[model samples]
Target: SPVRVGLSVDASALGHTIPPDYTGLSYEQAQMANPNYFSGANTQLAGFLRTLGRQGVLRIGGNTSEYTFWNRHREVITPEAVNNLSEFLDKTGWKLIYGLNLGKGTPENAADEAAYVMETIGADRLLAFQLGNEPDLFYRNGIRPASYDFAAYAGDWQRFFTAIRKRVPNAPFAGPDTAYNTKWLVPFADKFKHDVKFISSHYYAEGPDPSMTIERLMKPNPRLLGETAGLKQVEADTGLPFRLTETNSCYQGGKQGVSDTFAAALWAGDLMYQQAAAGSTGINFHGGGYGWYTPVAGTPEDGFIARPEYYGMLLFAQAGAGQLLGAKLTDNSAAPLLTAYALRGTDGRTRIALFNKNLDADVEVAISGVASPSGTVLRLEAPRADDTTDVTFGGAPVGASGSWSPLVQEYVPGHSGQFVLHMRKASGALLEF
Candidate 1:
């Protein structure tokens, strides 16, 4: 039996400013591990990031932000470390969304740190400054009592906000970086919308437990979708675009078999499309040396490598960024999963992504609304969903230069606005039109 999924794409109904750097990398504050990593000596990792996009965001500050001290009395961030990060960032053409210590450090201390980061990163590459990591968890983490709430967070947040702004008066900020309680978002935004540049939150589909699986992480779960869709209303009400700043397949370090495998690659690719579909301006897949849910493998000591999710992100940058065309996929949430997305370029070209999550069978798709029979095919695949080493995009893995050679996949030819294409199970293809 054939699996029929309908795709209705309105090329004219293009959406959002899909910035070239729609994908970002999130790291814990202490993950800066050593000045050597930031100093451009970690060329392996820096070199690989160069391939993701011409410009990107490096978000530093997570769970560690609450415990990591700024050492305002000493060489807190150090001029040498700043130079290293600045050089590495310049090489990669990326920006920084730095987080200050709103959890433990004083507004006065945060002000001093903000002044230095602003002076170093400057206006060109500093995206914005985030005041805290996850304030909602403060009570749960014993930073306060269970009584700690958004009102308290906002009031204390202002102290730090005013101090930082006073130090770097022109400094831009984004926050209320919440982990689970997103209900705090609207109020946080409403009260501080005029005081910030954008809003942010974090997400994880699963956790560190061994019970986690790729099947669970990959699904377009309603909870996740609903949360994403609701943020659009948050955007409209508060008048600020919300960024799901910290997100990945799982939390608490991530499951080994699931997070580090090839299925994560496919899941990540589809998941990113899901975010774009829901109107999220941007998202970052959390990572770091020894961090379980990380997309990058290895660490500073052993030399870092791009893991399955890193390539998953690269696949999107290669295919989906730019103008997103409205697309609908009519497929039941059953086995042999399927999802489709269409995108139009300012140059009048198009890229259509069709993903099939079922691992055992290939999905036959009849594509319509494509203007031409001729287009290129860039498929992401591996020997199997569990295997990690053989993954490739457009037929080749990323090489030393952070570039993939273009491999044009020819159309076998079918009929009318419809053409015959097969989405290999647990794999995806970016079809150019």
Candidate 2:
């Protein structure tokens, strides 16, 4: 007998609406210093970002934000840099989450940078100003004393918030951007819930290790799931939405073979749906030109290309704007890696995304509560989980500068409100009705 699974979806049990800006990218604060990249004139780069979807968020911050110094007099971050970024945001129709240097910088300098950023980008495009990168890790990173804790960080946060508020009275903010220490969220929300636009945190499924493999990358993580559950509770308790501001497959710039391969694509696509279904306001996958997990990598002059992980975002974009529906999956213990998600798209079509992360098991997924007999399946797959360049969605690789259109689509027919989807090992299918 084939490995069996079932999905029970309820459209009437409507859940959260996936925000248009939910798909996002995160870059190091230092990336802004590069004149050729992140500029409005970098049409090639902007084109690639736009391909992910318009109205997404471009978050500027990472470990480098801790060391990035803001000098008003020296013009370390030039005015032209801010202008080019504003133009890029204009071209892409995306918002910005600007991060300020708090670890090694003073409140006055942060306020100065915030004022300049707000004036150039305007409040319309600036989503929120993040005070620090990961204050929770400051002590270990040597930026703060070992005794530094959330209370100490909060005091500094208040100082910076006040300084920036003094310059831009209505300036919006988001923070307590911790590095995996989600416990900080509850107290951060309690103290500064009203001060922030949203609560932000980081998540790296696994830390960088030589033992990392595609199998480890695709496997389920209970700790990570529990963290998001805590985020939902915080959102419920505080009425403020939570966002994974910086996250990827592995920390420390991601593992080369694992984070850059088709496994990351499958892992990332499922992660987007998982976070959306769990009530997360948004997520920003962190990367850089050298970052192995960067969804889109390279420079405009050198030519930009979509990495394997990018196809995952493209797959999620297929569902478009919609309210995420409840998709309960019942899987045989033999096919435990299989998972499913559903969305009632704004285009008036319902979408179900299924993932078979198992390396060697094919599952026969019997989808129920789906009224349509015929549905379109756009396969998100590669030759193998480790294949990096061959990853594709809807049977075509994203073209140069991010141009993509479905070259092929499969038609699957069901019976009596039931669709038995035969999913191959290490693959995913986006079913549209």
Candidate 3:
């Protein structure tokens, strides 16, 4: 059937800014303070924003965002590292959602950060101020008092919101960036919906186990759908647009094997399509160069490289944009792992993104609505499912530092009429029509 697709990218989702202290550099260190620590109108920040503009919205302030503290008294940011980032946002054209520190912070502190962000970035360009980052994990991690409950947390949030509104009465906000606790959605929304613009949530598809393979992760898990569906219900109940603020294939900074593999490209593309179909306003993939689970190894000077899931993001960037159209599963049995979505570009181009999840055998797809005989196919795959090396697009290897080539026109078939695009166990492919 005919389908349309619309694309939106989160520019700040995968970017990170580290402090000098974290790098083990001295206070007087110039190298750590220059391009390494600062972010402004430089090539890195500009390039990142340009990429996001092509995709959609940019969600600044990831986990690091919650740790930033702006002191109104000192007229200085507690962690000066973030000042440079905020300055960078001052020049970018993308919409911003700054996350405020709520875990190890007070209502006064959050209000101060909110005021500082609005003053620097301006209220018009700022989308919303998010309170807390993954507050659901507070109990398990001891970030907050063990005795703290939703009621207490909500009370704290209310205090913070009240204080922020006092400073900037028209400031819009979103909240409760929980890890996976959908139960808190309604309760939190009920109290703060009037004061806040939207509700926010985060999701990850795996646990710390070997069973978190690509095939297993791809297989329809009711638990996964249940969490998102629950959030949808909350949105309907509260009458708000729910944002899947942060998401990725695997958690604990994403698995080295699956998260950074070609399989991840497929996972990301399919998930973005699924969320949009399911009524999510936007989605952000959590990424960084050096973290607990780094997708790419080595320095940023080599260029920003994607982990396996990064390719998935590229696939989404290439084929997932435009106007979203209606699509469905034709043969659930034969195409058990198939996820299909349509994109209608402003340029009058209709593109269909098909994600085939079958590991061993290739599946044939019969596209009836397409008008053109010739189309472009971009695939991210490797020879082995588990191997991280040898990831390629079309047929050439993709890296941070390498000569550009034309892999978009190349096509490989795993089956007939429906060209069988070769994808290693956990990779993603993009076919443009």
Compute each candidate's TM-score over C-alphas.
Answer: 0.92, 0.95, 0.79
lDDT of each: 0.75, 0.85, 0.57
Residue-wise lDDT of candidate 1 within 1-433, one digit each (tens)? 5465667777876776476777788887775446677656767778767777776788888878766666433124555566678887887887888888887788998888788778877988988888888887778778768988888988888999899888898988888776434557778888999888888878777642345677776565666766776677788787888787898877677777878888888888887877776677777778888655676666567776667777678788777467778776665344446777788765668888777777766766766677676766788888888775787877787765355665656553556777667666788788877
Clashing pairs in 2: 40-88
Off by over 4 Å in 1: 72-76, 179-183, 207-211, 330-336, 400-403, 406-415
lDDT of 3 by residue, 1-433 (tens): 2122212222222211111111000011121123343356344433443433343444544555444445543122543544554565554444566676676667777776677667666766677887777666677767777887888788778777888888778788887776546457667887777887878777777753456777776677666688778778878788887777777777666666677666666676677767766777777666555432333333445555444554454455555345666544455464467666666644556565667665664545544444445556666676765556576655665444322244557543323333333333334556665
lDDT of 2 at 92: 93
Model 1 residue pairs with clashes: 253-292, 253-293
- Comparing 1 and 2 on TM-score, the stronger one: 2
Supply the TM-score for candidate 3: 0.79
Off by over 4 Å in 2: 72-75, 180-183, 207-211
lDDT computed for candidate 1: 0.75
Over the full model, what C-alpha lDDT does candidate 3 score relative to the true structure? 0.57
lDDT by residue (13-62, candidate 2, tens digit) is 78889988898999988887775688877887788778888779999988
RMSD of each: 2.6, 1.9, 8.1
